[PDB]
Amino acid sequence: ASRQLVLVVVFVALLLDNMLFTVVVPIVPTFLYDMEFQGTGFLEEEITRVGVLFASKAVMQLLVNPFVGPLTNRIGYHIPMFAGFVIMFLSTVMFAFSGTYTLLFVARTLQGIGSSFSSVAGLGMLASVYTDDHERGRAMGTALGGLALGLLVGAPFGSVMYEFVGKSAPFLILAFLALLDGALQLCILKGTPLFMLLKDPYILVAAGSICFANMGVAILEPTLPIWMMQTMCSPKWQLGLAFLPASVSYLIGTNLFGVLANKMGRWLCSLIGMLVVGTSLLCVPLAHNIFGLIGPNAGLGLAIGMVDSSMMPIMGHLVDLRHTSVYGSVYAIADVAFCMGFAIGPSTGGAIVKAIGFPWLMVITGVINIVYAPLCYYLRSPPA
Amino acid sequence: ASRQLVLVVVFVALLLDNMLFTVVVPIVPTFLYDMEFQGTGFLEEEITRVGVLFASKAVMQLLVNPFVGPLTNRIGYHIPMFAGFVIMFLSTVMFAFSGTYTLLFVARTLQGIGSSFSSVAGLGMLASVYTDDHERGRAMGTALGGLALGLLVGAPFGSVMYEFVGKSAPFLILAFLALLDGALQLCILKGTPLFMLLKDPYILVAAGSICFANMGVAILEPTLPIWMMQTMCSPKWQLGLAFLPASVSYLIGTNLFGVLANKMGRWLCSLIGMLVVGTSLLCVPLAHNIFGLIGPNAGLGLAIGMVDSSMMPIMGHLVDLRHTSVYGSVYAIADVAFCMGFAIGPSTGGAIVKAIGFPWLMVITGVINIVYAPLCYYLRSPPA
Ligand SMILES: COC(=O)[C@H]1[C@H]2C[C@@H]3c4[nH]c5cc(OC)ccc5c4CCN3C[C@H]2C[C@@H](OC(=O)c2cc(OC)c(OC)c(OC)c2)[C@@H]1OC
Ligand SMILES: COC(=O)[C@H]1[C@H]2C[C@@H]3c4[nH]c5cc(OC)ccc5c4CCN3C[C@H]2C[C@@H](OC(=O)c2cc(OC)c(OC)c(OC)c2)[C@@H]1OC
Predict the structure, then answer these.
(1) CA-nearest residue of chain A to B360?
(2) Domain range holding A185?
(3) I need a labelling partner for B239 at 20 to 30 A (CA). Which of A343, B91, B194, B298 fits?
């Protein structure tokens, strides 16, 4: 029993969750194309179903989030984390051994449930173990940076491993890593609820800004590989590599602008980030080769880093100013915003790409971001 | 008689016209203040009249512009140019000796008529003298360079000279320069009309682009000095110097982006420059000292330079692609945009500032520019 073991456990759990989220994007469209028969343009018939597949995790996470907290209060913290590891291992094995469409849907649903359980339980355990105030910050920083590390490491992993070792290599590797995390976890040892926090306009503006900024990436996952295979004629191992700028630029932007944004005002950072997201999504569907998506994706990642570094401190400041705040107050609002974006984006986006073209979806999302960007003016000098 | 005299005549005429347009900015409100009266404040009662006074030039420029063409065809070019000198000299003398509000109105009106006549006749004479189709570009370029140069030394001239020499000095100097231009002038010697060009959407979008880009500076003239004397409490000689960044930044931006815009697309330059304007007009009314306007004014000038350097070649290309083009079709389409901007901006700005607050006007203009910015996506790849 030591304070570092819980940190390493939460680190590995969040890394595994984000890696399993990201790895699926290069793999599902390629597998669905391969099972029927770069050859054919029949993917338009399946776009609504591939889009609805991705939203299952967000929908189940939203459905299961409110019940997690009371369970942790009445039966502790370790058992919900063990449940999360078991569900994650079941999800990864089901992904590895699935052959049809329904099995992948079940895998995504189970992954959503396990992710919600593991996230809430791990945050609770890290809060409970450290009781120094200042120390909690350096622990939460490392644990939350683990998510970005997993996102960076796992984006081109699946696409490269699918065409070389097979369809069951990355999922079994993630299963072994989850088994290691579970084995490590085997050796261990209030105020203003969220629905009141979402009742004031100042928090709602920030949450909507975060959701609309992340919908650029939310609706680019299930629709970009299909677009690449239909038009660009790129090989199957480069589909995951097109998302590397979206992660590297995000990490660079979040570090640099967490350093710099306090000097020139946070609302200006949010406005410029939203505008850059809109312009980047507008310029995305003009590329005729894989090298042409290096620019717009990088700009997109930089603008999302802009918004995510300029909005969280504003949310914390508002919660401290007008309500009573706890350690995880900002986390619940951020998670609700992310899940709402990931659950509303793909489900409507698939319908839009069947009804009309893929570029019109990008133009619509960019225009929505640009129109919403002026509304960040409200956040400056928030009244008590 | 030669070909380098007409160039200097058109140069001096455009230079003096722009100086007389710009030097009235910090003289009218200060004259009203020191004729009606730290300082008791009532300028909110007269802001509407001050705003309406500035629109007369644009209004009867638009009213008189259609009639100058057939007159030039029937009776030549030199006589309408000499009439411009006579009307401009009358306007500057009237500005020098005016004491009441009606005289300033009629002087501005005369300046509008003289500016329209001088501009049309001068461009006609420059086109008539040169008939090489290569040196004509340099001939227009020098005159428009003088047009740009006037607005640099026009704004921080009246404000500085007013508090040190008096109210009758700069107008008399401009009158002497006008008489010199007339003395120089004394020793001298068709397709797709405009109303059909304003019928296709691809030109109307560009015209609205230029107009809504210049409305930010159009509504900033009559209302910024009054705001400065009401809040910032600056001396009377610093009102004119607050517009120098909007001139220098505009010149720098127009040079750089005329060099650079073709590499990254003209529509993207316009889209980026219509958002810098919206942010600049939003950060303008937050300053609490004179030194806080150096940033937003420079940004506004840079964005206007971006738009004006990325839109004119688009208009020329569109007119060549879909219609029949002449020497100054882009000139006419730009004039109809500038005059509409200067005629619609100040009046409604005065009404808004007397109805709601001054900062709300800049917020509305910035929101309008941001909303209209996505519509520049249409201008890429226009069909034939
Ligand atoms: C699945 O990806 C995630 O799930 C994370 C990211 C979401 C999004 C994203 N997805 C991609 C998928 C790709 O595959 C092809 C490629 C690129 C991207 C990008 C690029 C852009 N990107 C940003 C990532 C943001 C992460 O969230 C946090 O960093 C965070 C930080 C906090 O501390 C301040 C929080 O506390 C308040 C917090 O509360 C919930 C969350 C978020 O959840 C952990
Ligand atoms: C009165 O100001 C004008 O009247 C000129 C400018 C309008 C606007 C402006 N006003 C100010 C007043 C101030 O006092 C306090 C301070 C700052 C500014 C700024 C800063 C920003 N600025 C830009 C200036 C632009 C000029 O117009 C052209 O340069 C032009 C070029 C062309 O060549 C391509 C044309 O041909 C197609 C053309 O056709 C009609 C016009 C325009 O008309 C001549």
Answers:
(1) A377
(2) 1-189
(3) B91
